[PDB]
């Protein structure tokens, strides 16, 4: 696979999502960030990073350890895609933020997949940037039934960049 899709998960939401996103975009290899290295991250030019949100809008532990091993340097030569899971209902003030961290570094490459906030309902989020989401935002908790179409639509918007 040309496209690498790295995810960390605690309940398999992200993993199911990354699988789906691979089903749809195609030509991809799905990797748990928990069992990988920058060495494997840099085996790819075109990447899609799926990541759930933890305490204080932080990253799921595994994604947290992983990103720790990467620096802006590592995201420079890459086309990056951001796809953060989250709960808009139980965490108003911090919704699908985890991705904003990965974002802090990945803004050093070409990040595509910015999406609208329409139909999402939250008080705050570091994931909103320049007026819209830094990438795709999944909410399996409250909006599970919207996952497939958001994926189908996002892969559409993406196709171009990840080709
Ligand atoms: C410790 C904990 C903290 C969480 N914090 C947030 C949060 O800050 N913002 C948010 O939108 N979702 C938050 N969530 C929801 C998860 O990101 C969501 O349930 C996710 O889909 C789980 O991913 P997984 O099943 O791949 O592990 C939190 C979940 C847990 C367990």
Curated annotation (Swiss-Prot):
Entry keywords, A to Z: Electron transport, Flavoprotein, FMN, Transport
PROSITE patterns: FLAVODOXIN_LIKE
GO MF terms, alphabetically ordered: FMN binding
CC cofactor: FMN
Family, similarity comment: Belongs to the flavodoxin family.
Database matches in NCBIfam families: flav_long, PRK09267.1-5
Role description: Low-potential electron donor to a number of redox enzymes.
PANTHER family per record: FLAVODOXIN 1, FLAVODOXIN 2
Name recorded for this polypeptide: Flavodoxin
């Amino acid at each position: 696979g040309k496209i690498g899709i790295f995810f960390g998960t605690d309940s398999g939401n992200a993993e199911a999502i990354a699988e789906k996103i691979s089903k749809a975009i195609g030509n991809a290899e799905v990797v748990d960030v928990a069992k990988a290295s920058k060495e494997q991250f840099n085996s790819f030019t075109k990447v899609i990073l799926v990541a759930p949100t933890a305490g204080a809008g932080d990253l799921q532990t595994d994604w947290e350890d992983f990103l720790g091993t990467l620096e802006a340097s590592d995201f420079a030569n890459k086309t990056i895609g951001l796809v953060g899971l989250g709960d808009q209902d139980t965490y108003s003030e911090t919704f699908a933020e985890g991705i904003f961290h990965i974002y802090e570094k990945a803004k050093a490459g070409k990040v595509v997949g910015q999406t609208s906030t329409d139909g999402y309902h939250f008080e705050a989020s570091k994931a909103v940037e320049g007026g819209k989401f830094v990438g795709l935002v999944i909410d399996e908790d409250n909006q599970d039934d919207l996952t497939d179409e958001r994926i189908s639509k996002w892969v559409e918007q993406v196709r171009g960049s990840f080709a």
